Design a protein around this ligand. Structure first.
Ligand SMILES: [K+]
Ligand SMILES: [Mg+2]
Ligand SMILES: [Mg+2]
Ligand SMILES: [Mg+2]
Ligand SMILES: [Zn+2]
Lengths: 144, 117, 192, 76, 65, 100, 142
RNA sequence: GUAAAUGUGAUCGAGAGGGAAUGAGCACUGUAAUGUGCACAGGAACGAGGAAUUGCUAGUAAUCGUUAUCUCAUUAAGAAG
């Protein structure tokens, strides 16, 4: 009898990367947009340096494929992803550039805003009260 | 505990750098202001700061320096000084602490009182 | 390319031996005018019964350029109906054109409700529809049924066109257009 | 229940038996009769049209229509 | 007039001169009435929309259509 | 030999009269005479609100000034150019010359 | 004769693309796998070989320009040809040009292979680039 | 900065629709950024709108872009074409 020979592999329901859960049925691109700090654009960048076919689903990936992606997230600058692609450029505290993942984002924004408030930076005071800081008009819109 | 740092540089080195060198650290819009050269007003303000840091000794505070140079970025030469910035009505006093580097003097003073209905 | 013969609709369909099969409708349904593609710019709208001389499948594609966002997209409408005719010709086994004709015949309500009272309060009553209005409403209902059916459903739009038109031609309860024709006629009778 | 991302052997077997005697068939039928997603109704349908089990009758833009063993067209 | 300003470099010792560009309302006053608002600048007129309509027929403009 | 004479004018009746007068002069000398070429008119325009304040329905007016023009290209000897140029004065029409 | 018009564009652009890649006549820009073609585009191209489809379509623009005897093509002209409608949030969409850097690199690659000659007011074809196209078409239509 | 809807092929599959508040940056105009452009992150309401209410009869309505038009150093989600 004939056989299909074009079927996906036996698939797992969901998997863990980053203290984050990824739906195994979801195709790798929109699936890596679950981890904070991996947007659409950067998700495609990582996958083509780890060299994984974009059309596989997240639950088909081996441990090996998940290590390849895990390695590229901890150190993008090793696999020729240039610094203008990354979250945190010319860090005031370190001089360096780095890519913040998961809960590091909120923690870094907090420690930053808190420092400005300790010394009375007007920009940090407004964000704490729920006000706007990019010059937007606050009379007509943005109520409640 | 570690020394204060701005974009990689220690306060010891930073307080010794020329304005020309410090310019390689600052944000883009602040760099463009230093590239386009200082006004005659700004030069007097800066020369007074350099004089003051030199002149002051012991435990007594130096006198306040007043300015209407609102857009000037803060420089490592006016650290520890008391400076009055014009608010459109009065010279609002402040002390220039290390953490203010990379910002303009207008960023630390309100020209408009906060509203509570 | 495909043919060097006589004019057929989409270069595929016979364009002959067509019967209306309701004498009340005869003069108002153009299945004469041989056209290769359901598109014409013929400027008949500026006339007294000129919108009754436009060919049948033309009137039927115009009905699709709706829901606001699709205004003016007449190529898209032709693409859609082309496919529907393939589905229907297959399913039914007869010229898609006779399915379309019979859909119209069944789907027009014959009696309607209207205000008659002039010299006082306006009291509703039954009234009898003209040939022309009867067919105008048939197209309207067939279109409205299709549009709303497809909105947030996984099925393809050309397929929904084939579902409705077969059923309508066969006068089945299954058609949205046929049901609503029953409703209008029942209310008309209630106010008789 | 949600849709599926495989055509397992026993669904595959019975689809071959079901595709004969059907007339026009389309992406939706495989995905609304059986439990397959649109992304696996395309791949199976394309496979059967290489195997000569079905035949394609339209492919205009993305709108794509097929026929099975008891199709028969009009005649002049 | 093209006014000039002195500016000091980062050394606060060397000086250079830069020119102020003529822009904004300050030099585009209405040639009939000195107004700063509603000045038509096209075809090298420099006349306000109020003054234009009383003089238009003397200049040679007409409403054809 | 050749001359091209541009008659330029922001009044139509004048340009029509002066060109008819010059055409008559050409045909009276008979050097194989011809009509002028009617040029694309230059049209400068301004659009402004009618009211001197904000009140009322905003009503707008378009003023346009039309500079008509006519070209004669012609064959003459240098004396006839020098002598005929006495015709080209005391006109509201502006007159310009080209030569090769 | 104007030999190019005898075949369909969606068969010609894919056809030449293979002849380019199998001879490496054009070399990808650094980071071609993650760069976008314009600031108007939403994401980088779906085909990894997009750089070669650009090279294949650039020589087509030049063949038809030569066929109609137009003035030579400039870097600005090509940038407006490949342009698109940029998305701007809460504002109408607006027409924006393609990025020049890709186009400059392709034209400099083609110069080194002797396929494109720089004129004072634009770029132009050369005999080898014409004859490659000629010999392709003569098989492709048959 | 010299159209866009649009035409063919692929793709995606029922919040991969949507881009609001916000982060550290990279440039431009300017006497001065507070204004504008760009890249990366982030991802709010909204699943077709109560009582009411506004235009429009044919190359019209609605859709789609564009202004060597006006404002204009730099700024259009405005008018006038
Ligand atoms: K509002
Ligand atoms: Mg969008
Ligand atoms: Mg989106
Ligand atoms: Mg206004
Ligand atoms: Zn005036």
């Amino acid at each position: 009898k004939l056989v299909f020979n074009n079927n996906p592999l036996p698939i797992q329901a969901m998997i863990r990367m980053f203290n984050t859960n990824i739906d195994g049925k979801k195709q790798i691109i929109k699936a890596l947009t679950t981890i904070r700090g991996i947007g659409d654009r950067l998700s495609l960048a990582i996958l083509r340096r780890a060299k994984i076919p974009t059309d596989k689903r997240a639950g088909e990936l081996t441990e090996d494929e998940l290590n390849e992606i895990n390695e590229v997230i901890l150190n993008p600058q090793k696999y020729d992803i240039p610094e203008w692609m990354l979250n945190h450029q010319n860090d005031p505290i370190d001089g360096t550039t780095k890519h913040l993942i998961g809960n590091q984002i909120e923690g870094t924004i907090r420690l930053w805003n808190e420092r400005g408030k300790k010394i009375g930076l007007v920009r940090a005071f407004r964000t704490s009260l729920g006000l706007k800081v990019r010059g937007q008009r606050t009379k007509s819109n943005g109520r409640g | 505990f570690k020394e204060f740092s701005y974009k990689g540089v220690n306060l010891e080195t930073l307080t010794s750098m020329s304005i020309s060198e410090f310019k390689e650290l600052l944000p883009s819009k602040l760099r463009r202001s230093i590239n386009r050269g200082f006004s005659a007003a700004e030069r007097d303000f800066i020369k007074k700061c350099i004089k003051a840091r030199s002149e002051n000794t012991g435990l007594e505070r130096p006198e306040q320096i007043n300015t209407n140079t609102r857009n000037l970025p803060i420089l490592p030469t006016m650290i520890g000084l008391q400076i009055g910035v014009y608010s459109g009505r009065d010279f609002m006093p402040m002390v220039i602490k290390e953490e203010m580097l990379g910002r303009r003097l207008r960023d630390y003073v309100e020209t408009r009182k906060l509203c509570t209905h | 390319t495909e043919t060097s013969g006589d004019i057929k609709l989409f270069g595929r369909y016979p364009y002959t031996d067509l019967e209306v099969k309701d004498i009340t409708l005869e003069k108002y349904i153009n299945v004469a005018s041989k056209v290769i593609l359901p598109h014409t710019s013929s400027r008949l709208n500026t006339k007294k019964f000129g919108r009754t001389k436009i060919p049948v499948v033309e009137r039927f594609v115009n009905a699709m350029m709706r829901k606001g966002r699709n205004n003016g997209k007449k190529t898209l409408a032709m693409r859609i109906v082309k496919d529907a005719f393939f589905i229907i010709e297959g399913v039914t086994g007869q010229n898609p054109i006779q399915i379309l004709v019979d859909a119209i015949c069944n789907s027009g309500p014959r009696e309607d409700s209207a205000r008659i009272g002039k010299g006082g309060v306006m009291k509703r009553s039954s009234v009898d529809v003209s040939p022309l209005r009867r067919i105008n409403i048939a197209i309207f209902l067939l279109a409205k049924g299709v549009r709303n059916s497809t909105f947030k459903d996984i099925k393809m739009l050309p397929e929904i066109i084939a579902e409705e038109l077969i059923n309508a031609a066969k006068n089945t309860q299954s058609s949205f257009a046929v049901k609503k024709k029953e409703e209008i006629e029942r209310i008309a009778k209630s106010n008789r | 229940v949600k849709r599926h991302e495989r055509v397992e052997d026993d669904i595959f077997n019975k689809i071959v038996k079901d595709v004969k005697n059907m007339r026009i068939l389309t992406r939706t039928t495989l995905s609304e009769r059986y439990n397959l997603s649109l992304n696996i109704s395309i791949k199976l349908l394309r496979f059967l049209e290489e195997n000569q089990i079905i035949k394609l009758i339209s492919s205009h833009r993305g709108s794509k229509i097929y026929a099975g063993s008891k199709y028969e067209p009009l005649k002049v | 007039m093209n006014k000039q300003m002195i500016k000091y470099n980062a050394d606060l010792e060397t000086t250079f001169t830069v020119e102020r560009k003529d822009f904004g309302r300050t030099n585009r006053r209405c040639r009939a009435c000195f107004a700063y608002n509603g000045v038509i600048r096209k075809y090298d007129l420099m006349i306000c929309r109020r003054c234009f309509r009383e003089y238009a027929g003397d200049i040679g403009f007409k409403i054809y259509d | 030999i050749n001359v091209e004479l541009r008659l330029l004018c922001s009044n139509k009746k004048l340009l029509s009269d002066l060109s008819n007068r010059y055409y008559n002069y050409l045909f009276q000398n008979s050097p194989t005479a011809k009509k002028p070429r009617v040029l694309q008119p230059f049209i400068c325009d301004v659009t402004t609100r009618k009211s001197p304040c904000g009140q009322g329905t905003a009503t707008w007016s378009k003023y346009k000034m039309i500079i008509h023009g006519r070209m004669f290209a012609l064959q003459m000897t240098h004396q006839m150019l020098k002598d005929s140029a006495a015709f080209l004065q005391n006109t509201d029409v502006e007159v310009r010359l080209t030569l090769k | 004769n104007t030999e190019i018009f005898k075949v369909r564009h969606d068969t010609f652009i894919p056809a030449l693309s293979e002849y380019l890649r199998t001879n490496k006549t054009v070399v990808p820009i650094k980071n071609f796998d993650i760069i976008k073609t314009s600031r108007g585009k939403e994401t980088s191209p779906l085909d990894i070989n997009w750089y070669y489809t650009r090279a294949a379509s650039i020589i087509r623009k030049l063949l038809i320009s030569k066929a109609k005897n137009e003035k030579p093509l400039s870097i600005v002209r090509f940038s407006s040809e490949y342009g698109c409608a940029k998305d701007r949030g809460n504002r109408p969409n607006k027409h924006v040009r393609a990025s020049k850097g890709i186009i400059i690199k392709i034209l400099n690659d083609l110069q080194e292979k002797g396929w494109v000659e720089k004129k004072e007011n634009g770029w132009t074809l050369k005999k080898e680039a014409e004859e490659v196209s000629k010999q392709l078409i003569e098989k492709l239509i048959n």
